[PDB]
Amino acid sequence: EFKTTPVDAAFVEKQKKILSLFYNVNEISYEAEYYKVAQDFNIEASKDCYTNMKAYENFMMMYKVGFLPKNLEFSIFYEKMREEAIALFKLFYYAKDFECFYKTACYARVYMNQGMFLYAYYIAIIQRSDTASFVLPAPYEAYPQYFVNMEVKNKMDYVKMMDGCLDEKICYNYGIIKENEQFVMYANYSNSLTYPNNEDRIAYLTEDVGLNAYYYYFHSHLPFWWNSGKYGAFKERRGEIYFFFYQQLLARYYMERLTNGLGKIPEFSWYSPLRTGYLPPFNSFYYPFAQRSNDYELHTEKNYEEIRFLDIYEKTFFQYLQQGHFKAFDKKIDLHSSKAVNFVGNYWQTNADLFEEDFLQFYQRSYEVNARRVLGAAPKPFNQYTFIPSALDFYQTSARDPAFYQLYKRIVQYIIEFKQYQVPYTQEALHFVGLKISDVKVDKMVTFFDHFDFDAFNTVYFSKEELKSSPHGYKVRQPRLNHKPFTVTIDIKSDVATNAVVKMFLGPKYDENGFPFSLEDNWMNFYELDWFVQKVNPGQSQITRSSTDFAFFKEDSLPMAEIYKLLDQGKIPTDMFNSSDTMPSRLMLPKGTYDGFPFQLFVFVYPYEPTPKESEPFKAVVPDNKPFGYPFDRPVLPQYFKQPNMFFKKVLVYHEGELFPYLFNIPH
Amino acid sequence: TIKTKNVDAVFVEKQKKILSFFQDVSQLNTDDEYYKIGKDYDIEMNMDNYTNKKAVEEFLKMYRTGFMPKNLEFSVFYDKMRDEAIALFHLFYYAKDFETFYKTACFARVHLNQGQFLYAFYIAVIQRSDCHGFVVPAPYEVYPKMFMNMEVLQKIYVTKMQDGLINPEAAAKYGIHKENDYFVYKANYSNAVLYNNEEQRLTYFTEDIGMNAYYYYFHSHLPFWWTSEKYGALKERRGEVYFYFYQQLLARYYFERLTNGLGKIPEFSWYSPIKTGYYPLMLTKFTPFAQRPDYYNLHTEENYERVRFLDTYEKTFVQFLQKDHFEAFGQKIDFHDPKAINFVGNYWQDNADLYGEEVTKDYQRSYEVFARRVLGAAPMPFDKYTFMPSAMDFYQTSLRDPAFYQLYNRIVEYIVEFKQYLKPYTQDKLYFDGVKITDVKVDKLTTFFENFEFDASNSVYFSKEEIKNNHVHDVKVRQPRLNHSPFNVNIEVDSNVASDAVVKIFLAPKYDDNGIPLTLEDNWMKFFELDWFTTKLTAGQNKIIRNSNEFVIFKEDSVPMTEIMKMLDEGKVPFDMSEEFCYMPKRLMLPRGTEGGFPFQLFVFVYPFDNKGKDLAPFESFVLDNKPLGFPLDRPVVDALFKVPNMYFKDIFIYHEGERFPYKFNIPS
Ligand SMILES: *[C@@H]1O[C@H](CO)[C@@H](O[C@@H]2O[C@H](CO)[C@@H](O[C@@H]3O[C@H](CO)[C@@H](O)[C@H](O[C@H]4O[C@H](CO)[C@@H](O)[C@H](O)[C@@H]4O[C@@H]4O[C@H](CO)[C@@H](O)[C@H](O)[C@@H]4O)[C@@H]3O)[C@H](O)[C@H]2NC(C)=O)[C@H](O)[C@H]1NC(C)=O
Ligand SMILES: *[C@@H]1O[C@H](CO)[C@@H](O[C@@H]2O[C@H](CO)[C@@H](O[C@@H]3O[C@H](CO[C@H]4O[C@H](CO)[C@@H](O)[C@H](O)[C@@H]4O)[C@@H](O)[C@H](O[C@@H]4O[C@H](CO)[C@@H](O)[C@H](O)[C@@H]4O)[C@@H]3O)[C@H](O)[C@H]2NC(C)=O)[C@H](O)[C@H]1NC(C)=O
């Protein structure tokens, strides 16, 4: 069903080598290539495999000491682990060419903590300019322990131990099936036993594998601990990107709330109990994931110190706001400019750019890191290498915890407070002389659930014999949200002839009241659907635009088994290649109602100014000097959003078939 | 050196049949005889094979509505689950004879939930009079999931999926060895990986597989939900047993505190947060156990109703105390009567005898059940069959939770309050005419850790082939457990007139935390009973010698069920598994010593064995005396009116040899 890209022979050889490191991630095949290359790899005598000598020797000092042991949980939020992951990434990134890169990777895949390897290896592939174009397995196929609820994981573990189904018919009743000599396990989203509250209404978005992958992808595309100088001109906009990402995400998430009768994201206080608990079905074969009960007191003895830190980190920000202008971190900052937006984002992410340095240093403490440690509820790590995990310890599980949206809602609000310093758009900056939208029409917008498979073979262990054949075929089936394709047609009257930018946004039409939202208090609640350039004709014309073409949404990842078959034909999937860090299509729309749920479609047309000729860290970076989210990057005066080149359309989002996903997983 | 006992081929056959139910407990060998029987067994048709018409019909009405399904976790603390468990218990218990019992169990094994089955089966075997003398294996061999952390379990799982080791020497680094055709896994206590409060000092005790198995035996010998009518004499003494069991357990535990420098069991309030959390490292095939963080507020919205219940339950008692004499539960109770201890204990356990009924009913809300739920910190059950387990939903795991000891300390203390209504014994009742203890001498008391293995095979799933060939016993867990060297006690007594006598041995602390000597007035409930016996006194001077391993209140380790098969081939069964099932393990007799020698005291009481007007032989071969349990420390004492010539307090010191720390035994080199 998917867009393909023709791909030559050199590429296929390289892509295959790359993907082969993601097979049976959790054990070592004594007969696989990677193993022999790892053994043949004298790390000692090959300084000249690397661009950077310092990076080489740095890693060696560390490696003579010792790294995180195999099998333990890896998380980039713990200091010593991060420093080790960064050293290994430096190695991957400074590899002279693809050969040295492969060897290093084989070496690491054999002698190192697998989680740490996967983390570093992912990022390296995305960042190395000679690997820029190659494809990666979806995060749920590489780390399926972070995307599988415990019940399913155990069902698989016991099937492996049994060497298959004793009796097909008991198995069937447990949602276990044979298909083409592969096992398929049906999976429910977790019940009130996992979210002991209203937030369980939404488990089908928060547990969704696309959504969690998406977040993992956004991190790997530009990690907080790294410099953004590789993207040149983009560096001046890093904080802008950080805001936009969370604002969009939270806007999307709030829409799911509204359709499930849920309202505003609750606000919290470090000095008070947090209402909404989280109980994850995940474990690290050592500790189960830390639970957070309902009405959990954040301010208990073990958190006194971290809360102190988080409290000033926030209040320092308030003091910025109060002072208008001030020196911070070298700079003299004036909150009336855009060198400001960037700073503000960088401030809140304590990323490398905030310090003007290449990598985060040992001792520069992160607000997000401690926010997450406090909200995560875990007892304090036992030592350097051993912590008790929580959902907030990983990019791939973060989106599962209600507290995650509460934490980012807090940051995003503080940025909105800053945005009140920004001067609002005027009639002249928004009006498109001689152009008018006369109508917008939209096809029926319909959501629904349907089944989706992935290979979870990575959390299953195989024998020496089986390993010789690199084995898979442990598939998880899950209902996932989705929508039917639709067309937006825009009608435009115009006087003369230029390229135009067409932008589409989705916003709520009413609050939980039933009361119309006014733009003043809604601009933050619009998420972008699309961006494209158009040749405008004199007079009357119609722009037709299908959802399947929307610039900010991707098709589903193919599993490796399918990737391998495409590669066999000279093909790869475009979206996994050209745009992995984009949200999946199926999640484009929030679950509707049979009824039809009322939202609004915002259609913007403005003149196109041919600019930037760049090299993109995200697909959110479109070749335009306008802000991200423009014209909804800042406070609005509602009376300038009546230009003829704007159209707000009421749309209703329908739903079809079963409303509850669990009815998709019932036996006979 | 295992105390043996000889048996006939009729026994061996029944015994092999009983034991068959404990093999591969989570699976069916559709080849085994138990299957053929089980599959086709018609219960309605066999109604005439049961002592109780209506228990069969009650069961069959229950069974047609449907029982708890397979695989889900069973716990007796939930209404619908209990009632199914009891319903099945009755069926087992009223089976005409062994044949009927056996066929019935076959059916239950094939068709019912396995924790439900096992729970009922276990009790049935202890309860059926025609099964007295039979052996059941160790609860840790039956429910190995309950007796081990996630870490070991995952290693075990990993090894089964790979069908062995990819790398012998990497396995060794993980504490995984192959000896013979067995996989041995070393295992640490949870503090080697988790130290979230001071209570983690005691995990060699609270995680001890023996201690936990002990509590499950205690529950199984007399379930709270069942009358004790079957034990005759014990009925008017049930409450006293309940108190005595906890009082003892808590004295023993408190001792482990002192040697680890931790002092008194902390008090709590239903209205305040509780300090010490518990972070279970145990896995349910369906879910993780619930965690209680430190400073958990007991009184949050979800508990408002449960706490109103606990509070009135407590206050009603404070009112009984204030009233002294009153009619409760259709009985006039008087608090100056020592026999009121029956009612007191029954009231706190909310057991069937409190109501004078066969089986407790749903609407008779239990205090312990609701304390366990409140302290368990779980979210509310999803439905009748689906709950989030905590250590306290199971007898096998309760001792792992510091909050367990705080709960029962709480209840014991309230009982101590009532004890204040009892008159302290005078000189006259305690004085042995013409008998005097002149000396007591003890051999060095030393503790040490030594490795212990058990069959963990039930935690693992085998293939159809492996189930056929019966290679189903190959997983052992190696774990250091506390132990002690054998030691003697010499009692030297003078008596002018020959006569029969009881000798009693008690262990106690010597100092509080401030290092002030224990007065008896305050500390009579911190005495732990080591031994009960009788001897013949003669005119003149006698020497009485008693070895620690003749101590009646303790037993040897169970042997693995595999070794029981070896022995049954010779016509033998290990004695301590048969009639000493539910005593504490000997190895845990003494608290872990210190290397300088920790100060305790030994109390030795000698009094006349007059006749045996009334003696316990029903549940416990315990008080062959008209004497209260823990006599003479069963009520408040007066230092001055207490000491007589036939008592001796001796200062004793508890040593430790070898490694102080269990984890030191699991280091690979
Ligand atoms: C129960 O609980 C206790 C306490 O937690 C556990 O005890 C710990 O056991 C550890 C071993 O699993 C032990 O770590 C070793 O310490 C020794 C002595 O210093 C080291 O020699 C070992 O280092 C090797 O492994 C490292 C990573 O795994 C490597 O970084 C390192 O390279 C090294 O390998 C060797 O060194 C050479 C490098 O030049 C290499 O070429 C060569 O081939 C070697 O392989 C471990 O660090 C802990 O110290 C110990 N803790 C304590 C306090 O004693 C126990 O394991 C738990 N038991 C069970 C069964 O779970
Ligand atoms: C994902 O989540 C969904 C929802 O929780 C879950 O669906 C549930 O599945 C169970 C079985 O898997 C299902 O119940 C089975 O239910 C059927 C239907 O029974 C109906 O008719 C009854 C009268 O005849 C009536 O009393 C019921 O209320 C119902 O309308 C029933 O035939 C089965 O009966 C039992 O079989 C078991 C075998 O284990 C025996 O223990 C027992 O003695 C009975 O003979 C059985 O109960 C249930 O209804 C579904 N829940 C809902 C809300 O629809 C999925 O299974 C789960 N899927 C996966 C893959 O995880």
Whether residue B383 contacts residue B80, with contact meaning beta carbons closer than 8 Å, is answered with no
- Selecting from 3.40.50.720, 1.10.1280.10, 3.30.70.260, 1.20.58.220, what CATH number does the domain B189-421 have? 1.10.1280.10
Angle between helix B53-65 and B79-93 (nearest 10): 140
What kind and span of H or E run contains A351? none
Buried b / exposed e across B384-398, counting CB within 10 Å, b at 16+?
ebebbbbbbbbbbbb
Instruction: Indicate the residue of A289, A293, A461 with minimum beta-carbon distance to B377.
Output: A293
State the Cα–Cα distance between residues A523 and A416, nearest whole angstrom: 11
Distance B552 CA to ligand 1 centre (A): 44
Please name each of the domains of chain A with its CATH number.
1-188+451-480+557-570 (no CATH), 189-421 (1.10.1280.10), 422-450+481-556+571-668 (2.60.40.1520)
Cβ of B195 less than 6 Å from ligand 1:
no
State the Cα–Cα distance between residues B147 and B150, nearest whole angstrom: 10
Residue A463 and residue B279: Cβ atoms within 8 Å? no
Query: How near does any CA of chain A get to the CA of B81, in Å?
Result: 19
Q: Does residue A463 belong to the interface with chain B, where contact is any CB pair within 8 Å?
A: yes
Cβ-based contacts under 8 A for chains A and B: 132
State the Cα–Cα distance between residues A527 and A255, nearest whole angstrom: 10
To test the pocket of ligand 2, the residue of A154, A666, A668 to mutate (highest count of ligand atoms within 8 Å of its CB) is A666
Q: Which two tokens stand for residue A329?
A: 């971190």
Backbone angles phi, psi at B171, to 5 degrees: -65, -45
Residue A301 and residue B294: Cβ atoms within 8 Å? yes
- Selecting from 2.60.40.1520, 1.10.579.10, 3.30.420.40, 3.40.50.11540, what CATH number does the domain B422-450+482-557+572-669 have? 2.60.40.1520
What kind and span of H or E run contains A617? none
Residues contacting residue A513 through CB under 8 Å, at least 6 positions apart: none
Q: Give rounded-to-5 percent helix, strand, coil for chain A.
A: 40, 20, 40
The residue count of chain B comes to 669
Q: Could you state, in order of their start, the residue ranges of all structural domains in chain B?
A: 1-188+451-481+558-571, 189-421, 422-450+482-557+572-669
Instruction: Quote the distance between the C-alpha of residue A450 and its chain's center.
Output: 22
Query: How near does any CA of chain A get to the CA of B632, in Å?
Result: 45
Residue B154 and residue A286: Cβ atoms within 8 Å? yes
Preceding omega of A573 cis (within 30 degrees of 0): no
Strand ranges of the sheet holding B499-509, from the earlier edge strand across to the other edge = B176-179, B182-186, B475-484, B445-455, B647-656, B598-608, B499-509, B528-537
Chain B partners of A294 at a C-beta cutoff of 8 Å?
Answer: 300-302, 379
Q: Does residue A193 belong to the interface with chain B, where contact is any CB pair within 8 Å?
A: yes
Residues contacting residue B145 through CB under 8 Å, at least 6 positions apart: B153, B282, B283, B284, B285, B458, B459
Which residues numbered 356-395 in A keep a CB inside 8 Å of some CB on B? 377, 379-380, 382, 386, 388
For residue A170, give the chain B residue with the closest CA.
Answer: B70
Chain B partners of A166 at a C-beta cutoff of 8 Å?
Answer: 27-28, 464
Query: What resolution, expressed in A, was reported for this entry?
Result: 2.8
Residues contacting residue A36 through CB under 8 Å, at least 6 positions apart: none
Preceding omega of A631 cis (within 30 degrees of 0): yes
Which residues numbered 249-268 in A keep a CB inside 8 Å of some CB on B? none
Instruction: Point out the ligand 2 atom lying closest to the alpha carbon of residue A174.
Output: 60
What kind and span of H or E run contains B623? none
Experimental method: X-ray
Tokens 């058990």: give the residue. Answer: B454
Q: Which two tokens stand for residue B354?
A: 């409190």
State the Cα–Cα distance between residues A509 and A605, nearest whole angstrom: 21
Whether residue B174 contacts residue B135, with contact meaning beta carbons closer than 8 Å, is answered with no
For residue B187, give the chain A residue with the closest CA.
Answer: A286
What are the C-alpha distances in Å from B611 to residues A463, B430, B431, B624? Answer: 69, 17, 17, 10
Buried b / exposed e across A138-161, counting CB within 10 Å, b at 16+?
bbbbbbbbbbbbbbbbbbbbbbbb
State the Cα–Cα distance between residues A169 and A56, nearest whole angstrom: 57
Tokens 């709270």: give the residue. Answer: B224
Chain B partners of A192 at a C-beta cutoff of 8 Å?
Answer: 379-380, 382
Tell me if B189-421 shares its fold with B422-450+482-557+572-669. Answer: no
Amino acid letter at B577? M
Tokens 């005078």: give the residue. Answer: B426
